[PDB]
Amino acid sequence: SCIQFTRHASDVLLNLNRLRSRDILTDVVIVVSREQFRAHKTVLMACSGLFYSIFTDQLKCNLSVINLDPEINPEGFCILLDFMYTSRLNLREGNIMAVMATAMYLQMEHVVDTCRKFIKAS
Amino acid sequence: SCIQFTRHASDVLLNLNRLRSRDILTDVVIVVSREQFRAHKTVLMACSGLFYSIFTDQLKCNLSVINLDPEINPEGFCILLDFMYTSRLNLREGNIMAVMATAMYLQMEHVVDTCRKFIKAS
Amino acid sequence: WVIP
Amino acid sequence: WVIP
Ligand SMILES: O=C1Cc2cc(Nc3cc(Cl)ncc3Cl)ccc2N1
Ligand SMILES: O=C1Cc2cc(Nc3cc(Cl)ncc3Cl)ccc2N1
Ligand SMILES: [Cl-]
Ligand SMILES: [Cl-]
Numbered sequence: 001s002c003i004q005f006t007r008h009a010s011d012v013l014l015n016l017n018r019l020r021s022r023d024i025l026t027d028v029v030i031v032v033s034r035e036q037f038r039a040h041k042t043v044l045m046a047c048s049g050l051f052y053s054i055f056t057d058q059l060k061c062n063l064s065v066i067n068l069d070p071e072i073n074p075e076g077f078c079i080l081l082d083f084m085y086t087s088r089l090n091l092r093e094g095n096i097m098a099v100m101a102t103a104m105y106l107q108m109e110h111v112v113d114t115c116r117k118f119i120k121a122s
Numbered sequence: 123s124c125i126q127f128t129r130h131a132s133d134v135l136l137n138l139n140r141l142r143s144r145d146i147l148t149d150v151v152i153v154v155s156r157e158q159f160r161a162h163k164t165v166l167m168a169c170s171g172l173f174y175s176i177f178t179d180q181l182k183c184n185l186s187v188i189n190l191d192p193e194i195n196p197e198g199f200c201i202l203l204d205f206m207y208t209s210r211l212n213l214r215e216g217n218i219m220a221v222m223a224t225a226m227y228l229q230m231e232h233v234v235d236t237c238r239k240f241i242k243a244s
Numbered sequence: 245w246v247i248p
Numbered sequence: 249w250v251i252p
Binding site: 008111 | 162
């Protein structure tokens with residue numbers, strides 16, 4: 001018999017993104033080639049099958065630095081990290097291939113699905 | 123020119139609640155009288171003006187235990203912690219006074235607003 | 245607020 | 249997915 005506040009989840013995500021922009025309570029650095037991205041492990045786990053597996057590992061859960069596979073493009077990762085914290089995906093003709101490849105590696109099934117759909121249309 | 127995934131924020135919150143139920147990456151214990159509640163500092167901050175102030179404090183940000191004011195009712199806190207992680211509020215005739223008082227202390231303005239509305243109706 |  |  002609960003009542004529900006429709007905007008609650010969106011407002012929570014908006015505040016988590018504000019914490020990220022201000023580097024508040026970030027507990028991990030994701031290294032992608034020469035580029036570094038600060039984030040919250042819980043948000044990464046909630047969005048990605050790969051980060052979920054990494055941070056549930058009894059040894060990796062305690063690492064402050066995670067290095068991604070050298071094939072991963074920093075821009076594709078940046079676009080996906082922004083999507084994790086906002087629900088908004090900056091999908092463009094020039095980045096769609098790098099975004100799909102990064103989403104497949106990160107195990108972000110809904111992003112992979114829209115990339116396959118957008119590629120099929122063209 | 124971004125696209126948006128409508129269910130993303132709700133899915134993120136659902137996964138954060140799953141992490142909470144399994145006690146994964148919880149980094150704080152909230153003590154309410156004899157009762158203890160494990161949670162994620164970032165989720166508490168995203169939902170509550172009080173926790174936002176506590177965990178942005180250069181000294182309190184590093185505490186693993188936070189003791190609430192002894193006037194705070196553990197059931198009211200439990201109902202509000204559940205709302206933080208689900209968007210669902212278990213508001214009942216028998217708990218509405220304790221829920222409103224706890225939401226005022228935690229600075230959860232939308233919960234305070236619906237409690238005032240529900241009290242006014244009766 | 246809604247009835248979910 | 250939508251146009252926000
Ligand atoms: O496409 C995706 C997105 C995703 C997110 C998560 N994260 C969780 C899943 C569960 Cl069941 N509980 C807790 C968490 Cl944080 C796992 C796999 C995938 N695949
Ligand atoms: O009723 C409420 C709910 C709430 C949440 C937060 N938390 C934040 C606010 C901002 Cl601007 N950036 C980041 C965070 Cl985590 C503060 C005050 C209140 N009042
Ligand atoms: Cl996804
Ligand atoms: Cl609220």
